Design a protein around this nucleic acid. Sequence first.
DNA 1: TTCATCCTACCTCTGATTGGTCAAT
DNA 2: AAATTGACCAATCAGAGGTAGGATG
Lengths: 117, 92, 61
Amino acid sequence: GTWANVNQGLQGTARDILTTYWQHVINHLESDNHDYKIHQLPLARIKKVMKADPEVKMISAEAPILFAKGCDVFITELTMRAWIHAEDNKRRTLQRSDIAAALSKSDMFDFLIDIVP
Amino acid sequence: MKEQDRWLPIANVARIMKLALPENAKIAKEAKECMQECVSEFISFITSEASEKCQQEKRKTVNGEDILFAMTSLGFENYAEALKIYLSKYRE
Amino acid sequence: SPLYVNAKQFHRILKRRVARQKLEEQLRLTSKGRKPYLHESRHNHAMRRPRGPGGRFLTAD
DNA sequence: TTCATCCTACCTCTGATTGGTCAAT
DNA sequence: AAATTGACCAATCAGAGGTAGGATG
């Protein structure tokens, strides 16, 4: 189903936590009075990442705006998924190995195979 | 192109990470750098797919619809569905 | 390393491998590590700035 | 023709970058 | 004992945002 990625590879309580976060995101994304200027990530840097690829010619203002939101969500859910492993190892510090472990739980993250060996 | 421009700024990435964790949590430098690389690849991965479809259709501009289509194509169906109403409201 | 990965992602993963290799060469990146800092001027500022006894930049009133 | 919105270049104004010490591990 | 390393502080400057003028669809 269209939401399978939300819980994919997660166990027990973690499923509820990620599901509830997504619900929160979806509710926000439905809000009627968005400020399309204010984001945690700078639009110009998103555009620059996009423009690093010479195949990309022109870019609608729509695209960095969607990425601004999408990337926020991506960082948040991956961080929440990774924290599970830090807690499992009774650690207070999130390590790279926690991110690698999180990535291994869902094939949605297969695109990062070379980024995080 | 400047080499740092292939990535989103690390401080912004780390700040989003900090908000996703308990207040007592710490984040290794390597974890911030890793996350930075992951989220930047996410943009480039989806963009490349959108770009190639744009080129095939002889359109020069990548738009919001192109991003959403690439997202579902690449197995990010949840991201595409969640951002659908966001795009439509932006457009009105 | 597996032969089969996410079927929706595989072809784009291969295309991105080529693009990343080309970009690394474009940017003249050879070592497998980042610089200690990005900007000489920002390094200099951080080196020059007054600190407290605990190494922190002085608090602003 | 008029409308929408891209590009680049230029201008404001600024917020991400940054390291010595302490403390946790 | 010794080594490792992440939070802490905020001012300067690389750069984000805004947009005029031109172009495109």
